[PDB]
Write a protein that binds this ligand. Structure first.
Ligand SMILES: [Mg+2]
Ligand SMILES: [Mg+2]
Ligand SMILES: [Mg+2]
Length: 89
RNA sequence: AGUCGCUGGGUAUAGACCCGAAACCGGGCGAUCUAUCCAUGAGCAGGUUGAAGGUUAGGUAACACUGACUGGAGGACCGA
């Protein structure tokens, strides 16, 4: 929950599939990706924060699970999501 | 019966019959050899090996990590 409400409100509308959409995998993956990348700065300065890293790993596993489900449903939608977000490194 | 000479034998102090040390001390001369240093120059054919690093393709949540290409380290190797 390191993302502010403004940042959350910022990225939800760029990845929403329709008005009022906050549960679609694109919003979820984009929500996790922005939080994952933001936390990278914290873990650089705080390298002994093993307890907060457990939460970061969970966000990484959650994003992987969502992308794998999006793989089965619509591969074209999956492809656009990672290209826009720059995943699959 | 001493005393002063002269000559000779002996003695004392002197190198004291001649030659001969290892050494000791004083003043000088030497670092064109050599030992270390200082400054300023010069030399080291040829052939190997293949560190760190880099790039790239992967890979990682990120750091990592892997391959290839590269790179050219070393009181390193063979050898004038
Ligand atoms: Mg000389
Ligand atoms: Mg040598
Ligand atoms: Mg030799």
């Amino acid at each position: 929950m390191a993302l502010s409400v403004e940042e959350k409100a910022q990225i939800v509308n760029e990845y929403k599939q329709a008005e009022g959409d906050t549960g679609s995998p694109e919003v979820q993956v984009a929500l996790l990706s922005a939080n994952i990348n933001k936390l990278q700065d914290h873990f650089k300065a705080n390298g002994k924060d093993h307890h907060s890293r457990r939460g970061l790993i969970r966000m990484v596993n959650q994003r992987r699970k969502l992308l794998d489900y999006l793989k089965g449903k619509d591969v074209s939608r999956y492809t656009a999501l990672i290209g826009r977000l720059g995943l699959r490194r």
